[PDB]
Ligand binder design. Structure first.
Ligand code: DHE
Ligand code: DHE
Ligand code: HEC
Ligand code: HEC
Lengths: 526, 529
C-alpha cells in the first residue's frame, strides 16, 4: 500500500505556499511543471515519497538545487512542511502587485549616501560581469589583468546582468524575479537596492535614451504576465502593466503571455518589450507614467531574443518557433518586415552587426535547430534592395548553437555550438573572416578554435558558450561551462591572431555562463 | 449525486453544453454571466433551489409583463430546451466563456453588401430631424419623424435593446443591446433596415462611431461588460478588426483586476481616437484608429467607477462621472492627459452626456444632476477665457428631487431641463424641472424652477409612468420626453415647445412599448448638448 499523505492545517499550507512561490517557483515553475529544476507534480513526487523529497530539500544537489536545510535557509520544520506540500496538488499561482513588490523592496544605501564620484581604482568600463549560475553570484572580473575583482551574492537562480546608460549602476536579475542594483562607484561595490517583481522572470533593461540616463530600469516576468518600470536609482516600483491579452493573428484571449527580451530605444524615451505568446512588441514611453503612451505592434508569435542594428534605429528579433525574424523601426514606431531565416529555431542573443564586403550593413544569427548562420540586410537607405532580406545562409560547427558575436574593431564572426551532442563540437567555436566573404553563393570557410582543449578541461561535460568582447574590441572571452562539482574556466582569445591569450581559473569560478562587458553593454555595441 | 438526498436531476455532459450555450447567448444579457442578475432577477442556486424546477419551468415558458420574454409560448425555445434551462439553473454557475475573433466572425452577418446599398437617400424622410427611440421590453427601435411626430418605422434589433448612436454623416444608425448584439441600419434605403449585425460579447452597454473630421463612417466601436474588452469594427460592414482586452492593473493600488468593465465610449473631435471608460481599474483609454496593426493608445489614470460622461461645448474636454465616488474626471483630448478630478458635493452624479451652456456670470459650464439627491452641479469648462473658474464646481442647487438621470439643454434654448425618473414619489417622477439660464446670477441663492407635469400632459392613468431623458429636435426649438410605462400598459412621448414651455404634442401608438432612450439624428451625430 502507498504511503499516507499528511493532512496539513490552513496556516501550515499558507506558509508552505508562500515559501513555494517565493523560493521554488523560479526553478520549478509556478505550476510545478519544471524549468531549470525538475518537475515536482504529485504524479512524480508521490512515487519518490516523503523521505526522498526531505533528503533532497535538506542537502540539495551539486547540480543546481540549493541545500535549503543544511544552509539554514529553511528550518527542519519548514523542510518537512515543504516535503509534504510537494505531495499535495499544485496550488493556483498568485498575483504579484504593488503591495508585494513594495514589501520585498529594500534600499540598503539611500542615494544621498552613495559616492558622488568613482571611489575605487577599478577600470569600470572594461569590467566583465560574469554569471555564476549554480552559486547565486556574479563575478566582476578585470578586463585587462584577468583578475577577479570581486564576487557578489545576488540570489539563487541568477540569470544575467545589464548596465545603466552611464555605466555606474549594475543590474542583475534572477529567474525568480529578484532584482539587484549594484553601485560600481563604491570603494567596495555591493547591492544598494533590491526588489522582487514576480515569481518567474528573465529580463531587465535600463533607460538608454539620451537625457534619460539612470532614470529608469524595467523588468519583465514570465509570471505573473507583466512588466514593471522602476526608479533608476532606488528600484521603487512606479508602474506595473499586465501583458494578458489577445494573440495578434487569431485574436483569442491568452491568459499567460510571457515577457521575453527587453531592449531600450535610442531614438525615443521608450522601452522595447517582447510579449512571447501573443506575438506583440510593445513600445512603452516612460516620459509620463500616469498618462501612459504605448504602441502595441502586431508581429509574430514566439518572440524571444533580438538586438538593434548597427545604427541603433531598428530592432531585429527572433520569433524562434516559427523561424522568423521580425523588424521594427523604433523611430516611426511601426513594424517594417517579417522574414523566414531558412533555418531551424534562430537564437541570436543580441545578434552580430557588421558590414559585409558586398551586401552592405547586415545583422547575423545562428540557430539551435541547425548549423546555419543567416545574414539580413539592415540599410534601407544605402542598400534598398537588400534591406530586410535574408542575403546569405551558411553552415558552422553544427546544431545547438546559442550565440554569434563580433565587434566593430574586428574582422571575425564567432559562433558557438553550446548544445551540440558531440563534445568535440560543443567544446569548440567556429570563426569566419568577414573580409573574406563574397556573397557569390559559396559557403564561407571557418577556423575551429578548441576553447575547451585550450582550458585543459576534459572531465565532465564542458560546454563553451557566448563570446563577449572587451571595451577595445581586441579580445573576446568564452565560457567553458562545467558542472558545479567539475572544473570550469573563462578562455580569452586574441582577436588579431585567433590564438589563446589567457585562461581564467579560480575555486570560486563556479558554472560561469553569461559574461557582460560594462561598456559594450551600456552602449549596445554588437 | 443525482440519487443522493441533496442531488438534482443532473444533465448529460452534452446537454449541459447546450444549456450553457443558450444561457450565455440569450440569458446573461439580463441575468448576468455569473447569474447574479442585472435587469433580470438573480438566478444563483441558493435562490433557484427554493423556487424549484416547476416554478423555473413556468417562468421561462410564460415570462411576464415586467420584462421577461415568453420563451416557451413564443416558440423561441422548444419545450425540451425550457426543461434544460430549468435544470441548468438549479446546478452551479458555470465559468463565463471568452468571446474572441472566431466567435465574433461566426455571429457576423452582412445582409446587404455595401456595393448593393444606395448611393444616395432613396426615401423622403427628413433624416437629420429623425428620432431613434428605444422600445425596451419590445426588443425594437422606433424611427419617429421630428416634425410631423409620426412613427415612420419600427425595427427589430433583439431583446434588451439599450441605446442608439449615429455615424458622423448621419447615414448609418447603430444600436446595441445589453447582450452585446449590434445592429447596423442604412437610413438611405427606401425602407431602412438592418444591413449588418454581429455580437461582441455576453454583456455590453456602449457603442460609438468615429467622429474626427476626415474619418466619417470609417469605424464603429463597442465595449463589453463581459468579457472585459472592446472591439473596433469596420464602419460599413461591422467586420471585427481589432479586439483589445481591458484586463489590467487598478490605477491607484496597482493590483491585477480580472474583470474591468467597459462603461461609456465617446469619440474625440481633436484626434482620430475613441475615448473608452474602464470602470473598475479607473482608466480612461484614448485609442488611435489610424493604424490598427501598430496600435497607439494612451492609458490615463483617473478614478475608479467611471461610468457616463460627455464632451464640453468646445468638444475638446471629456467630462465623466466616477459615480460611486461622487467625482467628475476631466481629460484633455487634445494633449491626451488628465486635467482634473473634482467632487460635485452631491451623491452619485449621473449626467448622461451632460448639459453645456453659457452661465451669465460664470461663463461656459457643463452641468449634471444626481441619482442620490436633488442637487444640480456646474463645472467651469473654459480654461482659456475663465482660467480661475475652469474645472471647479461653481454652483450647486436643488431641482425636483433625488433619483434624477438626465439633464438637458441646447445652444438655441435658455432653459435647462432636469428629470427625476427614479424618485419614489410619482408626483415627482412624472414631472420635469426647468431653470431659466438667463436669470442665473451665481450669487449663492438657489435658482427657482418651473415644474412641467409631463406625465399629466400625456393623460396616462394606468401603471407607474416615469418621465426620462429630454432630447431636442434638430432646430433646438422642441424638447422630447419619454413617459415610460410597463410593457402591457400605455406609454407616450411628450413634445414640449421650448420658447413657451407649453405642451406641443403628445405621441401615442399601440407599438410605442416602453419607450426610453431617444436620440435625434442631428444632435447625436454632432455631439450637440
Ligand atoms: C528571455 C531571456 C533572455 C533575454 C534577457 C533580456 O533581454 O534581458 C535571455 C538571455 C540570456 C543571455 C543574454 C546574452 C546576451 O548577449 O544578451 C544569456 C547569456 C543567457 C544564458 C542562458 N539562458 Fe537565458 N534563458 C531563458 C530566457 C532568456 N534568456 C529561458 O526561458 C531559458 C531558455 C530557460 C530558463 O529556464 O531560464 C534560459 C536558459 C539559459 C541558459 O541555460 C543559459 C545558457 C545559461 C544560464 O545562465 O542559465 N540567457
Ligand atoms: C454604460 C452605459 C451607458 C453609456 C453608453 C455610451 O456611452 O454609449 C448608458 C447610457 C444610457 C443612455 C444614454 C443617454 C444619452 O443621452 O447619452 C440612456 C437613455 C440609458 C437608459 C437606461 N439605462 Fe443605460 N444603463 C447602464 C449602462 C449604461 N447606460 C447600466 O449598467 C444600467 C445602469 C443597468 C443595466 O442593467 O443596463 C443601465 C440602465 C438603464 C436604464 O434603466 C435606462 C434608464 C433605460 C433603459 O432603457 O434601460 N442608458
Ligand atoms: C534553482 C536555483 C532551484 C531552486 C530555487 C530550487 N530548486 Fe529544487 N531543484 C533544482 C534542480 C536543478 C534540481 C535537480 C537536481 C539534480 O540533481 O538534477 C532540483 C531538484 C529538486 C528536488 C528533487 C526531485 C527529483 O526528481 O530528484 C526537490 C524535491 C526539489 N528540488 C525541491 C525544491 C524546493 C522545495 C525548493 C524551494 C525551497 C527548491 N527545490 C528550490 C533547482 C532549484
Ligand atoms: C431581458 C430581456 C431578459 C432576458 C433575455 C431573459 N430574462 Fe429572465 N427575466 C427577466 C426579468 C426582467 C425578469 C423578472 C420578471 C418579473 O416579473 O419580476 C426575469 C425573470 C426570470 C425568471 C424568474 C425568477 C424569479 O425569481 O421569479 C427566470 C427563471 C428567468 N427569468 C429565466 C430566464 C432564462 C432561462 C432566460 C434565457 C432563455 C431568460 N430568463 C432571458 C429578463 C430577461
Amino acid at each position: 500500500a502507498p504511503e499516507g499523505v499528511s493532512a496539513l492545517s490552513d496556516a501550515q499550507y499558507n506558509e508552505a505556499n508562500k515559501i513555494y512561490f517565493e523560493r521554488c517557483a523560479g526553478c520549478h515553475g509556478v505550476l510545478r511543471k519544471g524549468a531549470t529544476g525538475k518537475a515536482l507534480t504529485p504524479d512524480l513526487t508521490r512515487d519518490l515519497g516523503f523521505d526522498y523529497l526531505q533528503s533532497f530539500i535538506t542537502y540539495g544537489s551539486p547540480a543546481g538545487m540549493p541545500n535549503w536545510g543544511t544552509s539554514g535557509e529553511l528550518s527542519a520544520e519548514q523542510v518537512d512542511l515543504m516535503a509534504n506540500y510537494l505531495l499535495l496538488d499544485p496550488a493556483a499561482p498568485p498575483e504579484f502587485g504593488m503591495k508585494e513588490m513594495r514589501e520585498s523592496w529594500k534600499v540598503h544605501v539611500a542615494p544621498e549616501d552613495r559616492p558622488t564620484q568613482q571611489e575605487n581604482d577599478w577600470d569600470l568600463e572594461n569590467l566583465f560581469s560574469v554569471t555564476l549560475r549554480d552559486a547565486g553570484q556574479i563575478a566582476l572580473i578585470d578586463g585587462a589583468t584577468y583578475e577577479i575583482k570581486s564576487v557578489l551574492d545576488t540570489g539563487y537562480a541568477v540569470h544575467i546582468s545589464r548596465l545603466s546608460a552611464s555605466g555606474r549602476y549594475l543590474f542583475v536579475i534572477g529567474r525568480d524575479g529578484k532584482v539587484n542594483m549594484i553601485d560600481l562607484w563604491m570603494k567596495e561595490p555591493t547591492t544598494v537596492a533590491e526588489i522582487k517583481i514576480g515569481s518567474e522572470a528573465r529580463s531587465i533593461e535600463t533607460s538608454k535614451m539620451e537625457g534619460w540616463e539612470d532614470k529608469y530600469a524595467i523588468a519583465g516576468a514570465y509570471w505573473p504576465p507583466q512588466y514593471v518600470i522602476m526608479d533608476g536609482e532606488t528600484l521603487e516600483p512606479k508602474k506595473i502593466q499586465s501583458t494578458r491579452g489577445m494573440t495578434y493573428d487569431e485574436q483569442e484571449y491568452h491568459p499567460e503571455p510571457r515577457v521575453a527580451a527587453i531592449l531600450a530605444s535610442h531614438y525615443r524615451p521608450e522601452f522595447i518589450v517582447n510579449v512571447k505568446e501573443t506575438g506583440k512588441i510593445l513600445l512603452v514611453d516612460y516620459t509620463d507614467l500616469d498618462n501612459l503612451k504605448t504602441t502595441e505592434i502586431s508581429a509574430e508569435r514566439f518572440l524571444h531574443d533580438g538586438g538593434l542594428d548597427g545604427s541603433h534605429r531598428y530592432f531585429i528579433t527572433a520569433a524562434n518557433a516559427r523561424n522568423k525574424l521580425v523588424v521594427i523601426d523604433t523611430k516611426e514606431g511601426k513594424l517594417v518586415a517579417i522574414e523566414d531565416t531558412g533555418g531551424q529555431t534562430p537564437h541570436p542573443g543580441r545578434g552580430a552587426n557588421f558590414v559585409h564586403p558586398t551586401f552592405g550593413p547586415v545583422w547575423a544569427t545562428s540557430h539551435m535547430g541547425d548549423d546555419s548562420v543567416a545574414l539580413i540586410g539592415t540599410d534601407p537607405e544605402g542598400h534598398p534592395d537588400n534591406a530586410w532580406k535574408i542575403l546569405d545562409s551558411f553552415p558552422a560547427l553544427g546544431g545547438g548553437s546559442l550565440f554569434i558575436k563580433t565587434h566593430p574593431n574586428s574582422q571575425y564572426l564567432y559562433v558557438d555550438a553550446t548544445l551540440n551532442p558531440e563534445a568535440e563540437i560543443s567544446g569548440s567555436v567556429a570563426v569566419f573572416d568577414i573580409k573574406a566573404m563574397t556573397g557569390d553563393g559559396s559557403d564561407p570557410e571557418f577556423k575551429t578554435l578548441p576553447i575547451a582543449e585550450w582550458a585543459g578541461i576534459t572531465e565532465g561535460q564542458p560546454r563553451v558558450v557566448q563570446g563577449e568582447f572587451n571595451k577595445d574590441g581586441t579580445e573576446v572571452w568564452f565560457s567553458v561551462w562545467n558542472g558545479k562539482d567539475q572544473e570550469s574556466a573563462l578562455v580569452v582569445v586574441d582577436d588579431k591572431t585567433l590564438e589563446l591569450k589567457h585562461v581564467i581559473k579560480d575555486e570560486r569560478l563556479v558554472t560561469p555562463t553569461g559574461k557582460f562587458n560594462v561598456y559594450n553593454t551600456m552602449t549596445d555595441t554588437y
